[PDB]
Amino acid sequence: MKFNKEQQNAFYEILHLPNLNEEQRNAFIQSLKDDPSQSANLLAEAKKLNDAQAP
Amino acid sequence: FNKEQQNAFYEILHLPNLNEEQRNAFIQSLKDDPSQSANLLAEAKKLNDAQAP
Amino acid sequence: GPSVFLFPPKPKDTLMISRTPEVTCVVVDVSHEDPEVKFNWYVDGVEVHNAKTKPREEQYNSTYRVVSVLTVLHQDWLNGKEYKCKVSNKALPAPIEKTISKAKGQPREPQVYTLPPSREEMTKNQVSLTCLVKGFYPSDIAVEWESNGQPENNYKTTPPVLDSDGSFFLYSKLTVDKSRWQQGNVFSCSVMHEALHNHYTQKSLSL
Amino acid sequence: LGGPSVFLFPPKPKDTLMISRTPEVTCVVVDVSHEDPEVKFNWYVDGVEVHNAKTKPREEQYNSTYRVVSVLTVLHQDWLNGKEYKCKVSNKALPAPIEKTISKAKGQPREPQVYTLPPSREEMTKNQVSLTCLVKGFYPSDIAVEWESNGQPENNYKTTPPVLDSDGSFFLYSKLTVDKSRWQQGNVFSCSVMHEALHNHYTQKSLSLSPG
Numbered sequence: 001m002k003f004n005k006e007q008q009n010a011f012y013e014i015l016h017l018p019n020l021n022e023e024q025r026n027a028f029i030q031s032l033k034d035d036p037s038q039s040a041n042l043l044a045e046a047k048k049l050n051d052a053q054a055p
Numbered sequence: 056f057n058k059e060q061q062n063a064f065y066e067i068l069h070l071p072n073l074n075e076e077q078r079n080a081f082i083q084s085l086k087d088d089p090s091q092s093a094n095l096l097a098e099a100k101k102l103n104d105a106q107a108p
Numbered sequence: 109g110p111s112v113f114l115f116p117p118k119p120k121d122t123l124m125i126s127r128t129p130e131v132t133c134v135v136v137d138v139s140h141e142d143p144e145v146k147f148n149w150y151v152d153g154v155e156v157h158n159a160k161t162k163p164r165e166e167q168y169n170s171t172y173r174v175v176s177v178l179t180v181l182h183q184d185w186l187n188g189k190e191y192k193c194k195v196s197n198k199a200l201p202a203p204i205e206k207t208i209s210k211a212k213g214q215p216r217e218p219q220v221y222t223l224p225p226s227r228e229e230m231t232k233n234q235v236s237l238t239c240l241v242k243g244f245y246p247s248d249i250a251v252e253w254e255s256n257g258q259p260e261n262n263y264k265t266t267p268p269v270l271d272s273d274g275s276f277f278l279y280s281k282l283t284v285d286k287s288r289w290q291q292g293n294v295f296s297c298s299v300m301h302e303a304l305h306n307h308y309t310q311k312s313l314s315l
Numbered sequence: 316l317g318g319p320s321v322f323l324f325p326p327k328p329k330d331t332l333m334i335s336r337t338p339e340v341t342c343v344v345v346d347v348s349h350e351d352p353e354v355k356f357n358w359y360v361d362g363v364e365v366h367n368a369k370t371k372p373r374e375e376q377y378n379s380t381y382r383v384v385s386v387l388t389v390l391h392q393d394w395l396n397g398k399e400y401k402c403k404v405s406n407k408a409l410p411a412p413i414e415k416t417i418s419k420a421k422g423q424p425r426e427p428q429v430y431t432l433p434p435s436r437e438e439m440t441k442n443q444v445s446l447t448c449l450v451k452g453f454y455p456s457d458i459a460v461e462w463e464s465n466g467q468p469e470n471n472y473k474t475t476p477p478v479l480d481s482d483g484s485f486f487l488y489s490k491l492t493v494d495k496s497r498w499q500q501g502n503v504f505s506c507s508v509m510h511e512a513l514h515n516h517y518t519q520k521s522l523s524l525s526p527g
């Protein structure tokens with residue numbers, strides 16, 4: 001569907017990051033929608049935040 | 056299911072020169088006695104051919 | 109008040125002479141107050157009298173359900189005759205009528221193709237045997253599986269789906285142990301439809 | 316006569332799964348009479364009212380009735396995480412306002428297996444042949460299936476509804492029809508499947524004339 005694989009992937013993984021809260025997750029996803037070119041950065045950013053907030 | 060019966064039923068259903076009453080009667084006989092399929096089909100075929108233009 | 113629903117016979121019953129097709133008139137929301145229900149059956153407008161009404165049965169609600177069954181001739185259904193149920197009961201201003209018949213339109217012969225498991229599915233413990241049935245009209249149809257004269261019952265069949273050209277298609281999926289498939293057992297997909305010769309055909313599938 | 320009726324429809328499975336798409340919940344009011352036609356909608360997400368819904372201009376029907384539709388844009392993650400969406404329909408002349416609530420089917424997600432099957436040898440005598448995509452073992456039944464070839468969508472396909480299997484999971488078949496010649500010439504065809512239990516909500520299988 002011509003669709004952006006990198007964007008779609010970043011969206012999927014961010015959706016499943018277990019240690020983000022709703023507000024954090026929603027914010028990353030919004031940024032993804034608004035600027036597809038920032039997907040790599042947003043996914044890396046979300047990964048670290050998720051790891052930082054691990055038990 | 057009985058193949059000869061099913062086959063006889065199918066053909067009699069499609070014989071173009073029988074009228075409704077004739078067709079229904081052959082089929083009823085088929086239902087009532089499955090063993091009579093061969094004769095009933097031969098009988099119906101001839102009647103159909105006899106009533107060709 | 110009450111409602112009435114009219115159901116056609118099973119596609120197989122109208123097609124196989126060994127079987128007895130029925131049209132079933134079902135009345136629901138039947139009052140406890142006035143529970144005496146009367147049916148009138150009509151075939152192409154002419155009243156018939158061979159219908160058998162079941163003794164009214166109590167429901168989930170504090171309500172009864174009542175059913176009458178009209179035995180029909182195979183040829184009559186297939187030749188497009190209309191069947192009307194007419195239900196009369198005081199908790200209705202006018203008596204309700206429902207009419208059904210086989211779908212109109214040129215009958216089309218179903219093409220039946222068997223497809224073996226996908227190569228990739230062979231890594232699983234169970235595999236899928238596929239029967240594609242396409243290009244048939246009307247949608248009334250029956251599909252079964254068997255092996256060595258005996259019925260295989262671990263199968264599921266999709267509903268008929270309207271195709272681009274106005275005809276219908278479906279798939280039937282038989283699930284078997286991979287080992288059974290590996291050994292060369294022959295499986296058959298049986299299809300019953302009015303546009304088939306003898307209303308019956310059968311396609312085989314083996315490794 | 317008996318008041319209007321309200322029907323509430325979920326978003327297309329694909330729209331909730333692909334971030335590049337915009338999922339909608341659709342509230343449809345029927346049996347609106349010509350004499351009351353001023354319908355008002357209130358939308359709620361898990362009980363909390365939201366205000367971004369847009370309403371379509373009333374449309375006249377077949378049976379001298381009116382039909383009016385309200386559309387609420389939703390977040391992918393909200394639908395997938397099980398949030399409830401309520402449409403509330405009101406009139407100055409409704410005895411009580413009507414409420415409808417929907418949400419995604421509950422239950423443990425199950426990953427589909429996608430298999431492509433070539434035409435039956437028997438079908439190779441026709442001018443058109445069927446390419447088959449079997450998708451089994453998925454839950455819930457919400458799913459999208461597409462075909463494409465050389466980067467571009469094929470659209471002469473039909474997909475059966477999801478069918479409940481023995482084990483409580485669902486399966487379906489998708490059938491693509493192509494000219495036999497296109498198949499004979501080695502054109503590659505792809506079955507794309509979208510479902511929440513898949514990585515990236517997306518997988519794809521290809522199919523072409525090849526060594527048996």
Ligand SMILES: *[C@@H]1O[C@H](CO[C@@H]2O[C@@H](C)[C@@H](O)[C@@H](O)[C@@H]2O)[C@@H](O[C@@H]2O[C@H](CO)[C@@H](O[C@H]3O[C@H](CO[C@H]4O[C@H](CO)[C@@H](O)[C@H](O)[C@@H]4O[C@@H]4O[C@H](CO)[C@@H](O[C@@H]5O[C@H](CO)[C@H](O)[C@H](O)[C@H]5O)[C@H](O)[C@H]4NC(C)=O)[C@@H](O)[C@H](O[C@H]4O[C@H](CO)[C@@H](O)[C@H](O)[C@@H]4O)[C@@H]3O)[C@H](O)[C@H]2NC(C)=O)[C@H](O)[C@H]1NC(C)=O
Pocket residue numbers: 111113115116117118121129130131132134136137167168169171
């Ligand atoms: C008081 O309680 C009553 C009890 O019913 C109960 O109600 C629900 C709420 C729940 O509690 C259940 O546990 C229970 O069933 C309740 O009665 C029901 O009332 C509604 C009406 O509001 C009826 O709703 C729909 O009816 C049609 C569907 O019924 C078929 O399918 C059901 C499931 O698929 C099944 O349960 C039914 O029994 C019926 O099944 C058909 O049965 C026929 C008849 O036997 C079969 O045909 C025969 O079968 C023979 C073998 O047995 C043989 O093969 C023979 O040759 C053959 O002719 C057939 O196999 C089978 N078919 C199917 C598909 O199952 C439905 O079609 C209808 O919708 C149609 O019409 C609408 C217009 O009115 C359209 O809008 C719609 O699009 C569609 O076209 C109804 O929506 C419900 O069926 C009733 N219950 C029963 C058992 O009939 C009652 O309403 C409650 N009181 C009040 C006031 O609400």
Ligand SMILES: *[C@@H]1O[C@H](CO[C@@H]2O[C@@H](C)[C@@H](O)[C@@H](O)[C@@H]2O)[C@@H](O[C@@H]2O[C@H](CO)[C@@H](O[C@H]3O[C@H](CO[C@H]4O[C@H](CO)[C@@H](O)[C@H](O)[C@@H]4O[C@@H]4O[C@H](CO)[C@@H](O)[C@H](O)[C@H]4NC(C)=O)[C@@H](O)[C@H](O[C@H]4O[C@H](CO)[C@@H](O)[C@H](O)[C@@H]4O)[C@@H]3O)[C@H](O)[C@H]2NC(C)=O)[C@H](O)[C@H]1NC(C)=O
Pocket residue numbers: 320322324325341343345346376377378380
């Ligand atoms: C007066 O006429 C109107 C005009 O509508 C009619 O359109 C078609 C259907 C045809 O009949 C024409 O001759 C008419 O002009 C009648 O409006 C209909 O009213 C019905 C109830 O009385 C209502 O019934 C079912 O609605 C649900 C499905 O609606 C879907 O799907 C149908 C076909 O499948 C489409 O026609 C609809 O447009 C609608 O499409 C969906 O639209 C979504 C929003 O745009 C979209 O997101 C979806 O992708 C899209 N889906 C599809 C598949 O296209 C159906 O699910 C309900 O099932 C319930 O069944 C029972 C009983 O209700 C209940 O217990 C269950 O729990 C289910 O909820 C309904 O049965 C129908 O949708 C209305 N049509 C429209 C277009 O809205 C009106 O009834 C007439 N009145 C009178 C007095 O005669």
